[PDB]
Design an enzyme around this catalytic site. Sequence first.
Site, PDB file in Angstrom:
ATOM      1  N   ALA A 147      -6.288  -3.355 -14.063  1.00  0.00           N
ATOM      2  CA  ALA A 147      -6.417  -2.703 -15.367  1.00  0.00           C
ATOM      3  C   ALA A 147      -5.315  -3.074 -16.351  1.00  0.00           C
ATOM      4  O   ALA A 147      -5.431  -2.743 -17.539  1.00  0.00           O
ATOM      5  CB  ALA A 147      -6.413  -1.174 -15.207  1.00  0.00           C
ATOM      6  N   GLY A 148      -4.261  -3.689 -15.871  1.00  0.00           N
ATOM      7  CA  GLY A 148      -3.152  -4.053 -16.749  1.00  0.00           C
ATOM      8  C   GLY A 148      -2.198  -2.924 -17.077  1.00  0.00           C
ATOM      9  O   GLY A 148      -1.511  -3.010 -18.100  1.00  0.00           O
ATOM     10  N   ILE A 149      -2.128  -1.870 -16.259  1.00  0.00           N
ATOM     11  CA  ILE A 149      -1.255  -0.748 -16.594  1.00  0.00           C
ATOM     12  C   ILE A 149      -0.366  -0.322 -15.425  1.00  0.00           C
ATOM     13  O   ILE A 149       0.805   0.042 -15.636  1.00  0.00           O
ATOM     14  CB  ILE A 149      -2.023   0.445 -17.180  1.00  0.00           C
ATOM     15  CG1 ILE A 149      -3.186   0.884 -16.268  1.00  0.00           C
ATOM     16  CG2 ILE A 149      -2.631   0.106 -18.509  1.00  0.00           C
ATOM     17  CD1 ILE A 149      -3.705   2.231 -16.661  1.00  0.00           C
ATOM     18  N   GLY A 150      -0.893  -0.304 -14.180  1.00  0.00           N
ATOM     19  CA  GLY A 150      -0.164   0.356 -13.121  1.00  0.00           C
ATOM     20  C   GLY A 150       0.885  -0.554 -12.516  1.00  0.00           C
ATOM     21  O   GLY A 150       2.109  -0.328 -12.719  1.00  0.00           O
ATOM     22  N   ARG A 151       0.452  -1.536 -11.732  1.00  0.00           N
ATOM     23  CA  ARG A 151       1.403  -2.460 -11.142  1.00  0.00           C
ATOM     24  C   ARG A 151       2.122  -3.209 -12.248  1.00  0.00           C
ATOM     25  O   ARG A 151       3.323  -3.485 -12.150  1.00  0.00           O
ATOM     26  CB  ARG A 151       0.695  -3.472 -10.224  1.00  0.00           C
ATOM     27  CG  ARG A 151      -0.178  -2.783  -9.171  1.00  0.00           C
ATOM     28  CD  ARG A 151      -0.904  -3.826  -8.347  1.00  0.00           C
ATOM     29  NE  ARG A 151      -1.811  -3.169  -7.411  1.00  0.00           N
ATOM     30  CZ  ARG A 151      -2.495  -3.808  -6.477  1.00  0.00           C
ATOM     31  NH1 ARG A 151      -2.411  -5.127  -6.340  1.00  0.00           N
ATOM     32  NH2 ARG A 151      -3.272  -3.102  -5.650  1.00  0.00           N
TER      33      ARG A 151
ATOM     34  N   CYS B 135      -2.706  -7.193 -13.300  1.00  0.00           N
ATOM     35  CA  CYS B 135      -3.466  -7.231 -12.040  1.00  0.00           C
ATOM     36  C   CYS B 135      -4.903  -6.878 -12.390  1.00  0.00           C
ATOM     37  O   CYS B 135      -5.637  -7.756 -12.868  1.00  0.00           O
ATOM     38  CB  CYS B 135      -2.936  -6.332 -10.922  1.00  0.00           C
ATOM     39  SG  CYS B 135      -4.107  -6.206  -9.340  1.00  0.00           S
TER      40      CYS B 135
ATOM     41  N   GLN C 123       0.883   4.037 -13.579  1.00  0.00           N
ATOM     42  CA  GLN C 123      -0.247   4.983 -13.487  1.00  0.00           C
ATOM     43  C   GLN C 123      -0.028   6.139 -12.508  1.00  0.00           C
ATOM     44  O   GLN C 123      -0.582   7.242 -12.717  1.00  0.00           O
ATOM     45  CB  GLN C 123      -1.490   4.241 -13.053  1.00  0.00           C
ATOM     46  CG  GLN C 123      -2.323   3.782 -14.112  1.00  0.00           C
ATOM     47  CD  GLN C 123      -2.897   4.950 -14.875  1.00  0.00           C
ATOM     48  OE1 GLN C 123      -2.336   5.369 -15.916  1.00  0.00           O
ATOM     49  NE2 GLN C 123      -3.987   5.480 -14.388  1.00  0.00           N
TER      50      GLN C 123
ATOM     51  N   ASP D 192       0.830  -1.210   0.000  1.00  0.00           N
ATOM     52  CA  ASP D 192       0.000   0.000   0.000  1.00  0.00           C
ATOM     53  C   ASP D 192       0.865   1.261   0.000  1.00  0.00           C
ATOM     54  O   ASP D 192       0.674   2.152  -0.822  1.00  0.00           O
ATOM     55  CB  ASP D 192      -0.941  -0.022   1.205  1.00  0.00           C
ATOM     56  CG  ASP D 192      -1.572   1.330   1.470  1.00  0.00           C
ATOM     57  OD1 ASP D 192      -2.100   1.951   0.507  1.00  0.00           O
ATOM     58  OD2 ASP D 192      -1.538   1.777   2.642  1.00  0.00           O
TER      59      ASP D 192
END
Length: 270
Positions: free
Chosen positions: A207-211, A205, A249, A170
């Site tokens: 959306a497929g962009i951030g992590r 994970c 992101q 987090d």
Amino acid sequence: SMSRVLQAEELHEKALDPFLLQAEFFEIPMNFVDPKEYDIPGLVRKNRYKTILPNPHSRVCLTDPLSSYINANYIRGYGGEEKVYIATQGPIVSTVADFWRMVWQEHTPIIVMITNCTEYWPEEQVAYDGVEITVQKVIHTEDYRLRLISLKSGTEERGLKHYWFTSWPDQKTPDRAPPLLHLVREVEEAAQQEGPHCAPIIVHCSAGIGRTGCFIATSICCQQLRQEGVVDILKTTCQLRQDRGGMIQTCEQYQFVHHVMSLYEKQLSH
Ligand SMILES: *CC(=O)c1ccc(OCC(=O)O)cc1
Ligand SMILES: *CC(=O)c1ccc(OCC(=O)O)cc1
């Protein structure tokens, strides 16, 4: 095309300067796709988020405009090598079958799932659109759970390794970097063990962009640091954004990649 080549000293200090990091990060274009690029009816049932869509030049197409759609993009690796990864959203009940069709079509040997994001793997066996998915073994480690899976469709059997990362933090502080670095290293070694021209590694994970972008950017910059002695997280992020809009992101994610690379540089220098 943006670039800031970091040597060791500047890397350690850059990771700890959030004001410069946010100034740099928010100049990178998101490169999101115009939703009116996909006017197919019923296509919105296949997207988790209305505005996070696959850039058309790198979109993975399955083999009906709707039947061949999946929210997934080919991603280049270090040095621009084509199709090293596929970044995709976490499957929804409506797309679990499309996801496994993609795994089969691409000969994907490795999936990386990044959680602290869905439910699509079987207890023992399940089948989707002709491919049978069998979980043979589950390995519990401190930073991830690895599932050794067999895929059977007709007379052909394939192996697959599914890495379920459970230590996504987090708060993206430096004390939380080691598990991610360990995952990156274990996955790149598994990928080398596949031999020449490894098929695409699927990363997701939600959306497929951030992590997802954090994981791929770290993977790329680990090869860069070993080969060139420097890291260029800005250039890497820019390359990732050309392949799929929105990769990495948040500024906190951007800082987290710097923390991970600063750690790895110290480890390499002993
Ligand atoms: C640096 C960066 O994030 C970037 C550069 C160029 C770009 O346009 C490529 C395209 O697909 O039109 C997107 C993102
Ligand atoms: C990169 C960025 O915008 C950022 C990083 C870290 C930060 O501090 C967290 C806090 O709540 O103090 C702010 C902004």
